[PDB]
Design a protein around this motif. Sequence first.
Motif, PDB file in Angstrom:
ATOM      1  N   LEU B  36       0.825  -1.203   0.000  1.00  0.00           N
ATOM      2  CA  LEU B  36       0.000   0.000   0.000  1.00  0.00           C
ATOM      3  C   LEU B  36       0.861   1.256   0.000  1.00  0.00           C
ATOM      4  O   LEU B  36       0.550   2.230  -0.695  1.00  0.00           O
ATOM      5  N   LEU B  39       2.349   1.614  -3.493  1.00  0.00           N
ATOM      6  CA  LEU B  39       1.362   2.085  -4.458  1.00  0.00           C
ATOM      7  C   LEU B  39       1.071   3.569  -4.281  1.00  0.00           C
ATOM      8  O   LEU B  39       0.794   4.266  -5.262  1.00  0.00           O
ATOM      9  N   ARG B  40       1.134   4.069  -3.044  1.00  0.00           N
ATOM     10  CA  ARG B  40       0.909   5.492  -2.808  1.00  0.00           C
ATOM     11  C   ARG B  40       2.075   6.329  -3.317  1.00  0.00           C
ATOM     12  O   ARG B  40       1.870   7.408  -3.887  1.00  0.00           O
ATOM     13  N   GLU B  42       3.975   5.475  -5.768  1.00  0.00           N
ATOM     14  CA  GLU B  42       3.861   5.440  -7.222  1.00  0.00           C
ATOM     15  C   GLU B  42       2.875   6.484  -7.727  1.00  0.00           C
ATOM     16  O   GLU B  42       3.041   7.007  -8.836  1.00  0.00           O
ATOM     17  N   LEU B  43       1.842   6.792  -6.938  1.00  0.00           N
ATOM     18  CA  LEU B  43       0.922   7.865  -7.304  1.00  0.00           C
ATOM     19  C   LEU B  43       1.631   9.212  -7.304  1.00  0.00           C
ATOM     20  O   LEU B  43       1.484  10.004  -8.241  1.00  0.00           O
TER      21      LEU B  43
END
Lengths: 48, 48
Positions: B36, B39-40, B42-43
């Motif tokens: 998680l 993925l954050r 990567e944002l």
Amino acid sequence: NLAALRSELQALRREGFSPERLAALESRLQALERRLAALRSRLQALRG
Amino acid sequence: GLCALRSELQALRREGFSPEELAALESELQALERELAALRSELQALRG
């Protein structure tokens, strides 16, 4: 918080960002959800 | 979301479940926590 990531992902798709990374992020998010659902079923299996 | 699975896992330890029994569940949980956080970031990598 996961739906908040989907909202940020869709916002990046609306703003015309990298399709290669937004696609990897989408499939990574689909994998994390499909693994959270399996992890829920394991903890729930201890009670029924 | 993922926070409820952490509380559901911490509560199992409170129910007498040894850390060796939940080792497969606590390792799967932490693997998704760092998933998680990755993925954050990567944002923010796209907006960067």
